[PDB]
């Protein structure tokens, strides 16, 4: 596929790192330039990376459960930073506990996320969605 840049990280006070390594590997293998800011990353680091590297998308991973708090407000900060319309994806284990997925998906879309992913989402689903959203297959 044609070469595109994403920012990838794990947000807030979340230290889970293994999926971050796998996502980097998988999206890199798919032909993306992955700008991996790693774990324990506040919103501002996602936006700084996206600006510095002219990223096409920001992929927010949230595993430890506090995503609902941590993820709120990112879309507005991106707009204010001049990243209007940038793709914003969120996945992992983004809420506390097993919940009704359609409610969770609407909650994060209402927060400004373009795509919202449930537990155990394969990297490959995200890769396909991002190619589709970027018009590169």
């Amino acid at each position: 596929m044609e070469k595109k840049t994403i920012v990838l990280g794990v947000i807030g006070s979340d230290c889970h790192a293994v999926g971050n390594k796998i996502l980097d590997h998988a999206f890199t293998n798919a032909g993306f330039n992955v700008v991996n800011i790693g774990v324990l990353s506040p919103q501002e680091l996602f936006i700084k990376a996206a600006i510095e590297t002219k990223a096409d998308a920001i992929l927010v991973s949230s595993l430890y459960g506090q995503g609902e708090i941590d993820c709120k407000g990112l879309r507005q900060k991106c707009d204010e930073a001049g990243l209007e319309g940038i793709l914003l994806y969120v996945g992992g284990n983004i809420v506390v506990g097993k919940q009704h997925w359609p409610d969770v998906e609407k909650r994060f879309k209402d927060m400004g996320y373009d795509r919202v992913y449930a537990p155990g989402t394969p990297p490959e689903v995200g890769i396909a969605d991002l190619k589709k959203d970027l018009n590169i297959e």
């Binding site: 006070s13 293994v18 790693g38 324990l40 506090q66 708090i69 097993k98 537990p119």
Partner: protein
């Protein structure tokens, strides 16, 4: 403070205390004189150190879950349910991740938002924000010993509050609550701050109050070789004993091969005792904790019971003093009280179905134990050498030089060179050694085991196999065999 492996003087410790208690206003609730009397009034049945002694005496494995929510009354109802409906033997209070970075501002917002939403928006109990008063309410509401379980590089104030709170165990250590949990904390700093936590327990023991300490064995939960895991636990036990700790539970995370896991837990206990006595700590009561599979779980709940109960069988036959319970919700989210009670009930049923049974010795077990003890000794020997006899300084230098190296650790102080992978029987082995200081004989054995997997699978051992092993249990099996 300079880092040395030497007990802090009373004056040194007090000076640090006065600084630490100022880090949040609940620090004012901590009065060591009053806390000693409070702690001594706790019945033995609610003292974690004393119940561990009992478990050893009786040759029982005790079950303990993970559990915590943002709000005090909700947290209490949860723990009472795990006690009463689950039949837990010990209770946790899993601390939220904001507390773990000392972000009590975010804890406070989380408490308010949790109140407003009618559900917990935190992934644990904000112990510092709830204070001594809140922590005592928890203890007074339950009938089992209580332990803080968390992942905190700087746990000094948390330790003050939970122990004055009547919680008679604290999990962690300066390596195991740094490298798996933090990116930017130096090893020296987390060792110093965990010396505080150990020294506080040392103070309490000097007044006749028994409080358990549990180094966190599983680390990143992801294919950690037994000898590296055990080197960390032995080190943390030694560093704790120097500050006056007298009741220590060393831990291990399941790798999945029953003989390797039993070898690992037996070596851990044996070498912890050996090292403590060699270094003159002769009054330390050592127990063990086995953690059920700390890697990814399958989503199917029935499959999850397959992991929970096989894990428990390994713990039981190993003679573990304690086993940490996983639930059928593990792949998805923090378990409901029902899901957690389910995991605890399945675990205790398995333990009771195996009452008194232990894995007998065999050539295979003896062989694997020799391998683990030799590997572990290589690592510890090098640490003492680097530190010129001082294990704390040796630990810092070991991390700097890759001698100690934890798979997948986010810490930038972790070399990230050593790479693990399973062999053909599912034993975790070393695929890439990095700077881990093994002899060629030791390296050879690792390669020989791995070559058997290459032959069976018809592919070279590689990082793709590591990836396959990371996903295997979630996909229904131990070993990441090809497609």
């Amino acid at each position: 403070m300079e880092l040395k492996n030497k007990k802090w003087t009373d004056e040194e410790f007090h000076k640090q205390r006065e600084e630490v208690l100022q880090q949040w206003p609940t620090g004012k609730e901590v009065d060591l004189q009053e806390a000693v009397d409070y702690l001594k009034k706790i019945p033995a049945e609610k003292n974690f150190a004393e119940k561990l002694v009992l478990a050893k005496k009786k040759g029982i494995t005790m079950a303990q879950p993970r559990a915590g929510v943002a709000l005090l009354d909700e947290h209490i109802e949860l723990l009472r349910y795990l006690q009463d409906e689950g039949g837990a033997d010990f209770l946790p209070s899993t601390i939220d991740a904001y507390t773990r970075q000392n972000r009590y501002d975010e804890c406070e917002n989380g408490i308010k938002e949790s109140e407003k939403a009618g559900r917990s928006l935190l992934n644990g109990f904000p112990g510092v924000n709830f204070g001594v008063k809140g922590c005592r309410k928890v203890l007074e509401a339950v009938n089992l010993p209580l332990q803080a379980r968390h992942g905190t590089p700087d746990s000094r104030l948390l330790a003050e509050i939970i122990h004055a709170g009547g919680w008679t165990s604290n999990e962690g250590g300066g390596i195991s609550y740094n490298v798996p949990y933090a990116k930017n904390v130096t090893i020296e700093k987390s060792l110093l701050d965990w010396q505080y936590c150990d020294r506080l327990v040392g103070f309490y023991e000097e007044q006749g109050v028994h409080i358990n300490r549990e180094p966190f064995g599983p680390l990143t939960g992801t294919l950690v070789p037994p000898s590296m895991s055990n080197a960390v636990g032995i080190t943390e036990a030694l560093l704790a004993a120097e500050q006056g700790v007298k009741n220590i539970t060393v831990g291990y995370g399941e790798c999945g091969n029953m003989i390797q896991d039993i070898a690992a837990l037996r070596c851990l206990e044996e070498q912890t005792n050996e090292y403590l006595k060699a270094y003159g700590y002769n009054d330390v009561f050592v127990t063990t904790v086995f953690h059920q599979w700390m890697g990814g779980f399958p989503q199917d709940e029935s499959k999850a019971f397959g992991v929970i109960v096989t894990a428990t069988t390994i713990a039981a036959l190993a003679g573990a003093t304690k086993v940490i319970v996983k639930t059928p919700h593990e792949a998805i989210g923090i378990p409901t009280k029902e899901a957690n009670a389910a995991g605890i009930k399945a675990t205790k049923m398995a333990l009771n179905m195996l009452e008194g049974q232990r894995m007998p010795m065999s050539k295979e077990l003896e062989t694997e134990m020799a391998v683990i003890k030799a590997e572990t000794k290589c690592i510890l020997d090098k640490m003492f050498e680097l530190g010129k006899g001082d294990l704390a300084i040796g630990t810092v230098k070991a991390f700097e030089t890759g001698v100690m190296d934890i798979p997948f650790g986010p810490s930038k102080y972790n070399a990230g060179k050593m790479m693990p992978v399973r062999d053909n029987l599912g034993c975790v082995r070393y695929l890439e050694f990095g700077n881990v200081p093994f002899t060629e004989e030791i390296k050879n054995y690792n390669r020989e085991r791995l070559q058997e997997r290459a032959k069976f699978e018809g592919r070279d051992v590689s990082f793709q196999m590591v990836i396959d092993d990371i996903f295997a249990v979630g996909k229904g099996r131990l070993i990441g065999r090809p497609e």
